Design a protein around this ligand. Sequence first.
Ligand SMILES: */C=C\C(=O)N1C[C@@H]2CCOc3c(Cl)c(-c4c(O)cccc4F)c(F)c4ncnc(c34)N2C[C@H]1C
Ligand SMILES: Nc1nc2c(ncn2[C@@H]2O[C@H](COP(=O)(O)OP(=O)(O)O)[C@@H](O)[C@H]2O)c(=O)[nH]1
Ligand SMILES: [Ca+2]
Ligand SMILES: [Mg+2]
Length: 168
Amino acid sequence: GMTEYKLVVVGACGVGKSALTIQLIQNHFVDEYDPTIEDSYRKQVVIDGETSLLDILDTAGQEEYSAMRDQYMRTGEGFLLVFAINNTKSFEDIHHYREQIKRVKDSEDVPMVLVGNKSDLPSRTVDTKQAQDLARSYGIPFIETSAKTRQGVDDAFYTLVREIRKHK
Ligand SMILES: */C=C\C(=O)N1C[C@@H]2CCOc3c(Cl)c(-c4c(O)cccc4F)c(F)c4ncnc(c34)N2C[C@H]1C
Ligand SMILES: Nc1nc2c(ncn2[C@@H]2O[C@H](COP(=O)(O)OP(=O)(O)O)[C@@H](O)[C@H]2O)c(=O)[nH]1
Ligand SMILES: [Ca+2]
Ligand SMILES: [Mg+2]
């Protein structure tokens, strides 16, 4: 009865993909999550009054082209583009992730949310306005999160569901 959405969490090594996902699903912050574990999780969620089943893939692996990775990513319906607000390289890498999503999905207008994680840290190198201007250019929402404090974590995933509902 309820819609199911396949969501995929992407972004550079160490930005908090696993921490964000494990906060959403299990309600705790993981300090040292094995950077090889790629796994999916399911969660029923009510968003704007309507329940959906989220099937969430937390990506991991090697920095390499993989045809089989393409085939799996093509089945994703929406993507979280995660960077860390204290890591300029992770923010520069966003463009590469968006390009790969569009490549494997035939240049669809893929539902995406830009996520600035580690908002609890005072060591910021990427300003809120720079990430808002990038999100504006791409036509997507921007959310600031902290997997450590839980701030914005539900909003990031909910916003992505809102984006898929608008697209479908
Ligand atoms: C510390 C290891 C780690 O987290 N990463 C990030 C990432 C892990 C997932 O692999 C990547 C993926 Cl899914 C894509 C990708 C493709 O291939 C198609 C569509 C969407 C999409 F996100 C990449 F483009 C990647 N590019 C480089 N490296 C990775 C991926 N990863 C390995 C490593 C940096
Ligand atoms: N201070 C802070 N550290 C974080 C946050 N999110 C993740 N981390 C830490 O950053 C490191 C990398 O996180 P992880 O989720 O493993 O990143 P992944 O490689 O993207 O899966 C870990 O030590 C986390 O505990 C956050 O919001 N704030
Ligand atoms: Ca848009
Ligand atoms: Mg991880």
